[PDB]
Structure formats: C-alpha cells, structure tokens
Amino acid sequence: ACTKNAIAQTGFNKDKYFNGDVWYVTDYLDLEPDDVPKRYCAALAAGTASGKLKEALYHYDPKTQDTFYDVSELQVESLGKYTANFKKVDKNGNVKVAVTAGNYYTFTVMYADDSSALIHTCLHKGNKDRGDLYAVLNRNKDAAAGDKVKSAVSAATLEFSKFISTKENNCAYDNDSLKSLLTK
Numbered sequence: 001a002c003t004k005n006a007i008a009q010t011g012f013n014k015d016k017y018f019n020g021d022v023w024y025v026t027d028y029l030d031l032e033p034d035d036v037p038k039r040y041c042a043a044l045a046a047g048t049a050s051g052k053l054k055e056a057l058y059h060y061d062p063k064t065q066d067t068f069y070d071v072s073e074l075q076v077e078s079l080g081k082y083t084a085n086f087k088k089v090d091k092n093g094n095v096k097v098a099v100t101a102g103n104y105y106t107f108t109v110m111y112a113d114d115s116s117a118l119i120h121t122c123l124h125k126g127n128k129d130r131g132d133l134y135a136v137l138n139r140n141k142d143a144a145a146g147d148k149v150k151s152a153v154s155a156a157t158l159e160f161s162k163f164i165s166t167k168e169n170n171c172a173y174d175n176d177s178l179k180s181l182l183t184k
C-alpha cells in the first residue's frame with residue numbers, strides 16, 4: 001500500500017504544468033520492492049481540454065515491449081494534488097478499458113519549473129498491492145537531472161542516488177499521440 005502524503009510545491013503554477021506539453025520520466029523511485037520493472041520508460045502530457053484538467057500517459061517496457069496509453073480527467077484535492085480516474089486507450093484514443101471506480105491514481109507535484117518536475121503518485125488498480133512511486137520529469141527526453149530538481153529531491157528527504165534512470169533504455173516516445181490524447 002501507499003504510505004506517503006506528498007506535499008505539493010508551495011506556489012505551484014498549474015497553468016505552466018498543465019500547458020498541453022509532454023513530460024518525460026527520466027528517473028524514478030518505487031518504495032515497494034519489485035513493484036515495477038527495473039528497466040522501464042514512461043511519459044505524460046498534462047493540459048486542459050474544455051476547462052477540465054487532463055493527463056495522457058504512456059508506458060513502455062523496453063524488454064517485453066508491453067505498451068499502453070491512458071487518459072484521465074483529474075479532480076482537484078488541493079493545489080498540486082489530484083485524483084485521476086484512468087481509462088486505457090490505444091494511441092488514437094480508442095477506449096480499451098473504461099473508467100471504473102477503484103481504478104485511479106493520485107498525483108502530487110512536489111516541485112516544478114519550466115523544464116523539470118518531481119512528482120509522487122499512488123496507483124490503485126484492481127486487486128494488486130502497489131506502493132508509492134516518485135518520478136523526476138523533464139521537458140526534454142532523457143535530459144540529465146538539473147540542480148533544482150535534485151535539490152528538491154533532497155528537500156523531500158529522498159536520496160537521489162536511489163532513483164533508477166530510464167535514460168539508458170532504448171525508448172522511443174510518441175509525443176504527438178500524447179498531445180492529441182488530451183482531448184480524448
């Protein structure tokens with residue numbers, strides 16, 4: 001189960017974060033052992049569509065090739081802290097698994113600037129016991145983590161040396177699909 005109440009960035013700028021552009025995961029930290037594969041790739045687009053906060057997600061396992069997309073409408077708990085009911089879609093936005101109660105993730109933006117972010121997410125899905133996940137994001141694919149986000153990791157009392165890099169996986173990203181999905 002998840003164990004952390006992540007604190008959102010003071011003065012979080014929602015319009016900048018939810019601007020329709022893509023964020024690449026560059027490094028991640030799962031608190032539960034073996035909760036996720038050690039080699040993985042992920043990215044998301046966050047934006048507004050007709051006034052609603054939306055995210056589109058992309059997951060890619062660079063070994064098994066397992067690939068999936070999700071779209072969510074986000075509901076506000078407080079500034080920088082959201083609850084998202086996800087639907088699994090193909091890259092075109094065609095629904096493969098409908099939204100269902102109990103299938104949701106929370107999402108807290110702990111730090112963000114115009115090129116980087118630190119987030120926490122707690123995934124709830126079916127009958128699987130899942131733990132907290134932290135992710136360092138960048139606007140640029142595979143960018144090395146800068147001093148601002150690394151300092152934020154420290155300030156959150158986390159050790160960046162424990163984060164797993166995604167940058168050395170042979171991963172490709174369909175940023176056009178992610179952007180398009182925001183409306184789906």
Ligand code: HEM
Pocket residue numbers: 025027028035036037040041042044057059068069070086087088097104105107121123125128135166
């Ligand atoms: C590199 C970082 C990440 C890794 C390694 C990772 C890993 C995984 C894995 C292995 C699954 C499939 C679990 C299963 O169904 O058995 C999964 C599902 C999921 N993850 Fe992630 N994830 C990452 C980042 C994220 C982020 C940043 C978010 C939210 C913004 C997120 C949200 C979700 C959601 C909503 C599902 C279920 C989707 C569905 O079943 O339709 N993940 N993740």
